[PDB]
């Protein structure tokens, strides 16, 4: 309940926050997520976190085609942001086809036009920053010291 | 997997909180009863969520066997019972006596038709055992939910006295269970309580009205079901509103005897009587006498417009002129009694074609325009 | 007085400004009448404050709103006569609870904020 | 209480307030229509 | 405290006042205290109100109708100025 | 009109009451059905398509 | 050569809505089929009395004729039998005329030589050899002695 | 008309109370026959 009060205060004082709004969806109960939260949330902003949250909600309702379409829209609207590639691959593994999962994984290749900062997106969203995270990455000297 | 983790969590919860509820129930057969009631009314939501997880996993597994039963059977518990009674055996679909008690005859026909020519492959033994244990655990949790709802019905006299007075005790227990608690239900708007437990029944070719959508547990309560169908939906709304008030009282523990309950139920009965009251006596208007003399009627812009609308148009004036002697072939096979007269006929005195008076254009009413704008 | 439980009760001076603001919001369609609409707005997170009446025989029918306000961090205030509140709301029927809603770039903003401050100055 | 009628400008108690409004703006042609209704009712023959 | 009124009551009060004023003017005309109202004539309304007489002397008719229009307009303006 | 037709096809499931009358042919009573024009246009277009 | 002309006695009023919806989804987009089937389920009103038409179809719908025709086609598959239907319709790439056969062999293969349906009046024209007629008579009389 | 509409009301009520008169196996046979016919004719479903 105190977490809900804090989230409501944060939304009131810091609107247009894609990550905060998406995580507020996860605070809200399932009967109250799609009915009221997601609509006003989409009205507020169209962040890649917004589209990722909509796709995740559809996947949680097992709306496979709707979730896939929203994931495609998320990919088109922004790349290497929000670490949505991991969620898309998980959805493909658990709901999509094996060939579809392989195609999704291949499209997540680290390249300047698409998924250039995929590791950076994972660090920013899935909290992949670590002392050995930079060492695992190619940029041992720079990334390890810049990141936590 | 997800099924194993959900089953382990459900068993852990049942070994402690459900056991505490069982001891509390058996005691009446400093640890007050309030915490037991609250933990039970949270356990209902916990088991509903874990049953949703189980139903999702069962859907994912059975999509290989039968990728269509999800749309055909919307209810989660009905889905679980259906897959339990079907399994890999889809030829069993014919004349299932067990399917009758779960699914209505309207949808058993549809599921049999779909399974006749479905593309779902037959599951292997590992999928069969996984699905069977999932269904067994799901039905066990459903039985636990039924027992805890029986407990809440028994405790209705203590938890929500006024709200138990307004409606049926079983309905009260069900609505608090689906809402998440007395406090959770009391915080909900009245227009939302009546939507509690409104399963998305699929129309099997029938109209949406046959489905009776946007109908909740309050709509199926004792008092609401005792009304004619045309008076049902409205009644539900009223009850819901009053039910909300009861919660907004019961959540603060006021009128534990139920005085607010009576003060609301009597007015509910009064509203029902008023709605069902016999129509009053209405005198019939005698036919007005025939008119004679002159009655002064004004002229002006409205009179000019009405005269233009109802006046004889040039094409209409030329229509009812029929040429003498010169016979015209009837161009309307469907009716010989219709002719254009001089309109289009030789000797009409018009070298050019008679244009259309747009003052006689056909247009919709104001209320029809309003309805069209609403339906847009 | 009549409702001793209404701890955050506004004085005679504050009630006039409150009702004037409610009427102005109704002119701008920034007002939601009734407890259910206030609860809906609070859940949607679009309201800014709630003006409620202290005269209601099943008084607890409004008591759910303050706690939810503490859940959503929204000021609330009590008023003496429900009929006056309803008249300010633009409805002849008595109204026991009303809410004021946020609109993007609303002209009422400052006035809203001012009244908000007063409520925080009224609390204890 | 004491409230000023928005249509009359007189100090009136709030207890009758709403009722004071309902019979405050009552249109006299409603009285005329009721009078003609009762006259035509008494003008009927068995 | 001052009390507001709903839009329905505002409309009903305005309608009642307007109907009262119209009935007052009509019954003043009934009793002879007021001359019967003249038709409101504009340029478009000219040939409809004074059609049978505008052919007698069109320029005088134009002057009369323009004088009536200007009288209404100047009455409105002087009411505004006095209200200023 | 086409947009309204598509919206009614996609969403409309409940309809208004349709009247019934009977033509008497002195041998049998043929049913005649009265449907609202708003739905009638949609049904006519659907039949043609 | 034996002719049978008859009609489906209550094909209008004995069409199930669920079966009709399923069969229409086979030929048209499921949204359209659901819309049509739900349109056939509306309230029938007259004066002071109204009811809910849930079993039968409503012949007054503009598209209803199509429904009936489609339903009649299904009835044909029950009467003709799919193979014989394919023998009369012909190959899907080269359909035959109203009353014509690709060759004499398929014409003489089956007893049902001609068949038309109209709206509800089915006219069937069989040709029978002596042995086939005798076998049919014996099979009929086995369960219906006279 | 009143008599026929009363009969229709009774018929609809009987259908609702006793359920559909078409059995599952008969419906399956009909639907399978239609599917076979449509597949054999290379028929494409009508698009929206």
Query: Are B145 and B44 in contact, with CB atoms under 8 Å apart?
Result: yes
**F23: closest chain H residue by CA:** H1
Q: Closest Cα partner for B61 from B119, B127, B2, B107? A: B127
Query: For residues A5 and B279, what is the distance between their CA atoms, to the nearest angstrom?
Result: 53
C31-33, strands of its sheet edge to edge: C31-33, C97-101, C47-53, C76-79
CB contact E82 to D (< 8 Å): no
Find the CB nearest A62 among B49, B56, B180: B56
Residues 33-92 on G with a CB inside 8 Å of H are 44, 46, 49, 51-55, 73-74, 77-78, 82, 85-86, 89, 92
Q: Closest Cα partner for D21 from A68, B86, E12? A: E12
Residue B251 has what DSSP assignment?
A: T
- Residue B153: phi, psi to the nearest 5? -60, -40
Q: Is B336 exposed, middle or buried (0-12, 13-18, 19+ CB in 10 A)?
A: exposed
Chains that touch E (3 or more CB pairs under 8 A): C, D
**F46: closest chain H residue by CA:** H48
Look-up of token digits 């079966």 = G19
- A103 phi-psi bin (left φ>0, alpha ψ -120 to 50, beta other): alpha
One DSSP character per residue, E13-28 reads HHHHHHHHHHHHHHHH
Look at the domain C1-124 and name its fold.
60s Ribosomal Protein L30; Chain: A; (3.30.1330)
Give residue limits of the domains in chain C: 1-124
Chains that touch H (3 or more CB pairs under 8 A): B, F, G
Residue B253 has what DSSP assignment?
A: T
Sign of CA dihedral B131, B137, B140, B144: negative
CA atoms within 13 A on the CB side of G101: 16
Resolution in A: 3.7
Chains F and C touch (3+ CB pairs under 8 A): no
Q: Count Cβ neighbours within 10 Å for each residue of C32-47 and write b for 16 or more, e otherwise.
A: bbbbbbbbbbbbebeb
Q: Closest Cα partner for E7 from C29, D31, D9? A: C29
Which residues from chain F sit within 8 angstroms of residue G44, using beta carbons?
Answer: 17-20, 33
Q: Is A100 exposed, middle or buried (0-12, 13-18, 19+ CB in 10 A)?
A: middle
Nearest chain B Cα distance for residue F17, angstroms = 12
Query: For residues C26 and C81, what is the distance between their CA atoms, to the nearest angstrom?
Result: 19
F29-34, strands of its sheet edge to edge: F29-34, F18-24, G43-46, G49-52
> What is the interface size between B and C, counted as CB pairs within 8 Å?
35
E6/C19 touch (CB, cutoff 8 Å), yes or no: no
Query: Are B246 and B261 in contact, with CB atoms under 8 Å apart?
Result: yes
Cβ within 8 Å of residue D18, ≥6 positions away: C83, C92, C94
- Convert chain G into a string of H (helix), E (strand) and C (coil): CEEEEEECCCCCCCCCHHHHHHHHHCCECHHHHHHHHHHCCCEEEECCEEEECCCCCCCCCCCHHHHHHHHHHHHHHHHHCHHHHHHHHCCCCCCCCCCCCCCHHHHHHCCEEEEECCCCEEEEEECCCHHHHHHHHHHHHHHCCC
- Pairing label, strands C31-33, C97-101: antiparallel
Query: For residues D4 and D10, what is the distance between their CA atoms, to the nearest angstrom?
Result: 5
Query: For residues H27 and B116, what is the distance between their CA atoms, to the nearest angstrom?
Result: 10
How far is C-alpha G58 from the geometric centre of its chain's CA atoms?
Answer: 18
Nearest chain E Cα distance for residue D11, angstroms = 10
Query: Could you tell me which residues are beta bridge partners of residue C99?
Result: C32, C50
Query: Are E65 and E41 in contact, with CB atoms under 8 Å apart?
Result: yes
Cβ within 8 Å of residue B313, ≥6 positions away: B357, B359, B360
Query: Are F35 and G61 in contact, with CB atoms under 8 Å apart?
Result: yes
Query: Are B182 and B251 in contact, with CB atoms under 8 Å apart?
Result: yes
Q: How far is CA C40 from CA A2, B121, B249, C82, G116, in A?
A: 20, 47, 19, 20, 63
Neighbours of B277 (CB within 10 A): 8
CA geometry: angle at E21 spanning E15 and E23, to 5°? Answer: 100
Q: Is F19 exposed, middle or buried (0-12, 13-18, 19+ CB in 10 A)?
A: middle
Query: Could you tell me which residues are beta bridge partners of residue C98?
Result: C33, C51
- Pairing label, strands C47-53, F29-34: unpaired
Q: Quick one: which H or E segment has residue A51?
A: helix A48-60
Which residues from chain F sit within 8 angstroms of residue B376, using beta carbons?
Answer: 4
G121-126, strands of its sheet edge to edge: G2-7, G121-126, G112-116
Query: For residues D20 and D13, what is the distance between their CA atoms, to the nearest angstrom?
Result: 9
Query: Are G41 and B206 in contact, with CB atoms under 8 Å apart?
Result: yes
Query: For residues C117 and B215, what is the distance between their CA atoms, to the nearest angstrom?
Result: 43
Q: How far is CA B314 from CA B304, B307, B309, B311, C72, in A?
A: 17, 14, 13, 10, 71
Find the CB nearest G46 among F20, F46, F47: F20
Which residues from chain C sit within 8 angstroms of residue A4, using beta carbons?
Answer: 71
Residue C50 has what DSSP assignment?
A: E
């Amino acid at each position: 309940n105190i977490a809900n009060t804090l989230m409501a205060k944060a939304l009131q004082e810091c609107p247009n926050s894609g990550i905060l709004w998406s995580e507020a969806i996860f605070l809200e109960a399932r009967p109250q997520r799609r009915t009221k939260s997601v609509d006003a949330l989409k009205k507020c902003e169209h962040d890649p976190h917004v589209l990722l949250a909509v796709a995740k909600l559809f996947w949680s309702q097992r709306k496979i085609t709707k979730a896939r379409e929203w994931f495609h829209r998320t990919v088109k609207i922004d790349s290497d942001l929000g670490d949505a590639w991991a969620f898309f691959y998980k959805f493909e593994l658990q709901h999509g086809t094996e060939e579809q999962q392989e195609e999704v994984r291949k499209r997540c290749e680290s390249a300047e036009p698409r998924h250039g900062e995929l590791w950076c997106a994972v660090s920013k969203d899935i909290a992949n920053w670590q002392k050995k995270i930079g060492d695992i990455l190619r940029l041992v000297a720079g990334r390890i010291k810049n990141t936590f | 997997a997800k099924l194993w983790d959900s089953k382990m969590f459900a068993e852990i919860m049942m070994k402690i909180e459900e056991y505490i509820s069982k001891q509390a129930k058996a005691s009446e057969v400093a640890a007050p009863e309030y915490r037991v009631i609250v933990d039970a009314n949270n356990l209902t939501v916990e088991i509903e969520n874990e049953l949703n997880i189980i139903h999702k996993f069962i859907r994912d597994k059975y999509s290989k066997r039968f990728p269509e039963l999800e749309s055909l059977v919307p209810n989660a518990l009905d889905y679980i019972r259906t897959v339990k009674e079907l399994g890999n055996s889809l030829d069993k679909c014919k004349n299932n006596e067990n399917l009758q008690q779960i699914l209505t005859n309207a949808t058993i026909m549809v599921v049999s038709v779909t399974a006749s020519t479905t593309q779902g492959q037959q599951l292997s033994e590992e999928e069969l055992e996984r699905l069977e244990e999932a269904c067994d655990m799901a039905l066990e949790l459903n039985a636990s939910k039924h027992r805890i709802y029986e407990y809440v019905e028994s405790r209705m006299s203590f938890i929500a006295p006024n709200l138990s007075i307004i409606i049926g005790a079983s309905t009260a227990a069900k609505i608090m269970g689906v809402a998440g608690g007395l406090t959770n239900l009391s915080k909900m708007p009245a227009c939302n309580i009546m939507l509690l437990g409104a399963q998305r029944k699929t129309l099997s070719g029938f109209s949406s009205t046959s489905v009776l959508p946007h109908t909740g547990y309050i709509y199926h309560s004792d008092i609401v079901q005792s009304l004619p169908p045309d008076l049902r939906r409205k009644a539900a709304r009223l009850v819901a509103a009053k039910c909300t008030l009861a919660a907004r009282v019961d959540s603060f523990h006021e009128s534990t005897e139920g005085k607010v309950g009576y003060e609301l139920k009597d007015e509910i009965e009064r509203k029902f009587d008023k709605w069902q009251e016999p129509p009053p006596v209405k005198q019939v208007k005698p036919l007005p006498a025939p008119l004679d003399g002159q009655r002064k009627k004004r002229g002006g812009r409205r009179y000019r417009k009405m005269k233009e609308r109802l006046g004889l148009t040039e094409i209409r004036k030329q229509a009812n002129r029929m040429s003498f002697g010169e016979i015209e072939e009837d161009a309307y096979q469907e009716d010989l009694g219709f002719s254009l007269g001089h309109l289009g006929k030789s000797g009409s005195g018009r070298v050019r074609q008679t244009q259309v008076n747009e003052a006689t254009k056909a247009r919709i009413s104001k209320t029809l325009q309003r309805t069209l704008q609403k339906q847009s | 007085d009549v409702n001793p439980k209404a701890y955050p009760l506004a004085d005679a001076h504050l009630t006039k400004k409150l009702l004037d603001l409610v009427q102005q919001s109704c002119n701008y369609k920034q007002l939601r009448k009734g407890a259910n609409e206030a609860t809906k707005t609070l859940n949607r997170g679009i309201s800014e404050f709630i003006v409620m009446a202290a005269d209601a025989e099943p008084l607890e029918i409004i008591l759910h709103l303050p706690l939810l306000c503490e859940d959503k961090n929204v000021p609330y205030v009590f008023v003496r006569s429900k009929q006056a509140l309803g008249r300010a709301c633009g409805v002849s029927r008595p109204v026991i609870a009303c809410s004021v809603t946020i609109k993007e770039g609303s002209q009422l903003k400052q006035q809203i904020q001012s009244i908000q401050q007063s409520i925080e100055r009224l609390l204890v | 209480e004491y409230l000023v009628s928005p249509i009359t400008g007189e100090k009136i108690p709030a207890s009758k307030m709403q009722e004071h409004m309902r019979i405050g703006l009552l249109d006299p042609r409603w009285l005329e229509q009721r009078d003609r209704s009762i006259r035509e009712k008494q003008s009927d023959d068995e | 405290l001052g009390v507001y009124l709903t839009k329905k009551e505002q409309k009903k009060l305005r309608r009642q006042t307007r109907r009262e004023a119209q009935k007052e003017l009509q019954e003043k005309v009934r009793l002879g205290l007021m001359p019967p109202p003249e038709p409101k004539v504009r340029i478009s309304n000219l040939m409809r109100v004074l059609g049978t007489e505008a052919v007698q002397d069109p320029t005088k008719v134009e002057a009369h109708v323009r004088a009536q229009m200007a009288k209404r307009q100047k009455a409105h303006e002087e009411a505004n100025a006095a209200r200023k | 009109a086409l947009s309204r037709i598509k919206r009614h096809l996609l969403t409309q499931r409940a309809f208004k009451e349709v009247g019934i009358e009977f033509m008497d042919l002195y041998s049998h009573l043929v049913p005649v059905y009265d449907v609202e024009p708003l739905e009638k246009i949609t049904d006519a277009y659907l039949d043609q398509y | 050569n034996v002719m049978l002309e008859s009609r489906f006695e209550k094909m209008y009023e004995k069409i199930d809505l669920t079966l009709l919806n399923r069969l229409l989804r086979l030929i048209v987009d499921h949204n359209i089929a659901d819309y049509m089937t739900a349109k056939n389920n509306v309230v029938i009103n007259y004066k002071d009395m109204n009811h809910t038409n849930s079993y039968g179809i409503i012949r007054g719908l503009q598209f209803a004729s199509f429904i009936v025709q489609y339903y009649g086609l299904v009835m044909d598959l029950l009467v003709l039998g799919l193979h014989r239907a394919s023998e009369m319709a012909g190959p899907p790439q080269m359909p035959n005329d109203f009353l014509s056969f690709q060759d004499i062999a398929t014409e003489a293969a089956h007893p049902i030589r001609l068949f038309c349906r109209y709206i509800d009046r089915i006219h069937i024209f069989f040709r029978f050899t002596a042995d086939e007629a005798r076998d049919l008579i014996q099979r009929y009389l086995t369960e219906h002695p006279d | 008309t009143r008599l026929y509409l009363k009969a229709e009301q009774e018929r609809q009520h009987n259908y609702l109370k006793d359920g559909p008169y078409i059995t599952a196996e008969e419906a399956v046979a009909v639907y399978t026959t239609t599917v076979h016919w449509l597949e054999s004719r290379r028929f494409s479903p009508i698009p929206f």
